[PDB]
Design a protein around this nucleic acid. Structure first.
Lengths: 31, 153, 65, 255, 115
RNA sequence: GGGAGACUGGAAUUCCUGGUGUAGCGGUGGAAUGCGCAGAUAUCAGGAGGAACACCGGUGGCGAAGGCGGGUCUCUGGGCAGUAACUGACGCUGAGGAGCGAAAGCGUGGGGAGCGAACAGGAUUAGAUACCCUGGUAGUCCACGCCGUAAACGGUGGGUACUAGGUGUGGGUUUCCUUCCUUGGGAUCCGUGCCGUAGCUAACGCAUUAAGUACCCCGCCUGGGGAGUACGGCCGCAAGG
């Protein structure tokens, strides 16, 4: 199939990973 | 010239000297179709050279040509998406054309107050190896030598 | 093509001691010749390669002279 | 950068907005821009959904870059025109950073229109694997002079020729010496006086033909790239000339 | 000194050629480089620069008493052909030609591919 | 080249030492950082150390999958063929569950030649947190353990029976040309490719190694985003799953 779907999925996963990197310390302090 | 070489115009010999070279010279110095004036200029220059040196116009003209005739030149060649100044061998016809063009052009920048006198002085200096056209030939040969490394393509 | 001289009824055994039988199978640079240019079967080609390597290890053939 | 805007009809404020929006693209162009013009028009018919028409023309160092857009108002048309012009200038760059991925790379991998054509020798490849020597001429070893050897060259249409010299009694090979004339190579170099008299303008190679084996001769020919190799064979002790043939094998001429 | 017989080592890389004449015990007696004959930058990767360097090294060995030499070529082909031709052309007799290029048996990791 | 352990071989890169030896070497599309003139690069001799095993070497072998080739020895798993001596349906699949599971990554202790995230400069560019160049730390390596993900793909779950062929190639048995040397050819069992019937498909294509004809068991799907995300829970040192 076309790689457009894979592009959407990788963008979503990348954004989630960046969010996790940004809030790692806050999650640890609240967890 | 995409479909092949074009035919050459067979220019005729001169009346008062009987040589192809002087006719080529008058065609080179020709401007605006004033062929009579160009012929007058060339004939006067040849007579001035004859009076100054005492010999025949044609022999000293040929000596000047051989003095200013180039054998190697430099052209911009693009190989592999990159351009270089490649030295190239010059065909005899191109060498004669370049020599005559240089002679005329450099005689046009002289300071002898008249086209006939400027042309006579330039041809005499080229015969003796002192003309600016000789210097141009020396410079173009030097430039061809300096880029010899690019001669393999 | 060519013949596997070992699959024949006169096929000499492959050993790392008999150096001439191996020298006839390596190129002039000492590299092991390919199977197609030789024509031997796969098992005999592998045995030849193993014998050549062993002979090199015991200093009987040069390492790419 | 200076821009001239030739508006039309009633477009109040469109000129200044277009001027200030388009003049910001000068830094985007990688070459100086000259006489950059813009034009704004409005469709008289109200039936057009996008009535405003914007056109822009730039002269980036002799290269004409033009764009045209439609919009519902001056601001939208100008913004779309700016985006279009930015895309065009991006595609125009032509500087090295934008022309570095299209230049042919590597040596054999990948092929392009301007990729360097493969250098092919006159002979069929026939790689060292099963190259062999399947041409062995022994045309003539009757003694000859330089002129006679040259004539025997000419009608045979062969660049080089191996004979035996008259005066020396030694084997020799003549070949075209290029613009210098012809060149003569002997098994043992001798001057011209001992060499039989001649009229052709030739020169003699000062080096002697060396002694070496068949495999060594093939290796020297491969690593030296000459059209042939003239040598004294080690085992035979006599002259020999090897040349790469027209089928890929080596042509060994022996007495 | 006087060394009638020696060896010639030619290292032709992708951007330079180095020619060194050597007393067969391994001692360099005269060397000429591609950049030593007036070239610099990419200009010194050309076969003509290899020709000039080989001729210069040949003269710098000839006045030292070297007559007959044997050549050891090395490196990817840039000007090896012209290097040996120039070595011969400068009056230096060539004994034998040997290709001795360091060929690893798949050792060390090569640098990553360019793009 | 299925796996584990032990010992060990050579080419090459790097570094060190000592000769010869000079003014450049290196690098690119072109250059500059950089190295060298305190003796570099080059060449020879010697020494130290780490990693990977050129030729053999392929659409060829083994393995359930990941994956697996320098050599030798020890221990060990699986497969195929023939005889059919033996037991006599003991078979298939398998929710959960357990085990193995590329690379990257984490912990402790070693090792560190080359390569090299990060990080420095050089260069290109309007801008270069990049592509190119010079250096370069983790890491790549070894031992014991963690994690449990991949375009972990043939994007094709496992078992069985049947349905035209033709031709490569790997392994093993046998009849006839018969020299019996020979891919001689035939027959047969087990793999691994290519082309092609019927048949199937939306088409591309698959086609005895089925995506054909049917039977048994398991997993999974019910429009696209939101989202394999939030909450809750389990595992994990952590990343995270």
């Amino acid at each position: 199939g076309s790689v457009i779907k894979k592009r959407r999925k990788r963008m979503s996963k990348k954004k989630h990973r960046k969010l996790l990197r940004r809030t790692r310390v806050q999650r640890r302090k609240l967890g | 010239p995409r479909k092949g070489p074009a035919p050459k115009r067979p220019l005729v010999n001169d009346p008062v000297y009987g040589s192809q070279l002087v006719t080529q010279l008058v065609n080179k110095v020709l401007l605006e179709g004033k062929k009579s004036l160009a012929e007058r200029i060339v004939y006067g220059a040849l007579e001035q050279a004859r009076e100054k040196t005492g010999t025949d116009p044609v022999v000293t003209l040929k000596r000047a040509l051989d003095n200013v005739k180039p054998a190697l030149e430099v052209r911009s060649r693009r190989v592999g998406g990159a351009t270089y100044q490649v030295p190239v061998e010059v065909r005899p016809d191109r060498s004669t054309t370049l020599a005559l063009r240089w002679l005329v052009n450099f005689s046009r920048q002289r300071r002898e107050k008249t086209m006939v006198e400027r042309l006579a002085n330039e041809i005499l200096d080229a015969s003796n190896g002192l003309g600016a056209s000789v210097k141009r030939r020396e410079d173009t040969h030097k430039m061809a030598e300096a880029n010899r490394a690019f001669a393999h393509y | 093509t060519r013949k596997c001289v070992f699959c024949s009824k006169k096929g000499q055994t492959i050993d790392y001691k008999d150096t001439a039988l191996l020298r006839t199978y390596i190129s002039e640079r000492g590299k092991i010749r390919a199977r197609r240019v030789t024509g031997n079967c796969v098992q005999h080609q592998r045995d030849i390669a193993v014998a050549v390597k062993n002979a090199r290890e015991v200093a009987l053939l040069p390492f790419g002279s | 950068m200076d821009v001239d805007v030739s508006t039309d009809g009633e477009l109040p404020g469109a000129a200044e907005y277009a001027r200030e929006k388009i003049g910001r693209l000068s830094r985007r162009a990688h070459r100086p821009v000259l006489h950059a013009r813009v034009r704004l028009t409005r469709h008289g018919d109200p039936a057009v959904e996008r009535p405003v028409i914007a056109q822009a023309n730039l002269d980036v160092n002799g290269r004409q870059v033009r764009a045209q857009v439609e919009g519902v108002n001056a601001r939208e048309a100008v913004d779309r025109l700016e985006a279009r012009l930015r895309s065009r200038l991006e595609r125009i760059a032509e500087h090295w950073e934008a022309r570095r991925g299209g230049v042919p790379a590597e040596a054999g991998r990948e092929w392009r229109h301007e990729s360097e054509p493969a250098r092919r020798p006159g002979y069929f490849p026939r790689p060292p694997e099963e190259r062999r020597i399947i041409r062995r001429k022994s045309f003539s070893m009757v003694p000859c002079t330089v002129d006679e050897a040259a004539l025997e060259m000419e009608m045979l249409d062969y660049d080089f020729h191996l004979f035996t010299e008259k005066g020396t009694g030694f084997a020799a090979v003549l070949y075209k010496g290029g613009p210098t004339g012809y060149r003569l190579v002997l098994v043992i170099p001798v001057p011209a006086d001992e060499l039989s008299p001649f009229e052709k303008p030739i020169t003699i190679s000062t080096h002697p033909a060396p002694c070496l084996t068949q495999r060594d001769a093939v290796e020297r020919l491969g690593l030296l790239g000459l059209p042939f190799l003239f040598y004294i064979d080690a085992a035979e002790g006599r002259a020999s000339v090897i040349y790469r043939r027209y089928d890929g094998h080596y042509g060994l001429i022996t007495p | 000194k006087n060394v009638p017989h020696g060896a010639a080592h030619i290292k032709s890389t992708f951007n330079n050629t180095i020619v060194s004449i050597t007393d067969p015990q391994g001692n360099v007696i005269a060397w000429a480089s591609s950049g030593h004959v007036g070239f610099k930058g990419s200009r010194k990767s050309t076969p003509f620069a290899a020709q000039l360097a080989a001729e210069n090294a040949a003269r710098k060995a000839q006045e030292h008493g070297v007559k007959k030499v044997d050549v050891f070529v090395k490196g990817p082909g840039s000007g090896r052909e012209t290097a040996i031709r120039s070595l011969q052309a400068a009056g230096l007799e060539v004994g034998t030609i040997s290709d001795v290029t360091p060929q690893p048996h798949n050792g060390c990791r090569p640098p990553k591919r360019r793009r």
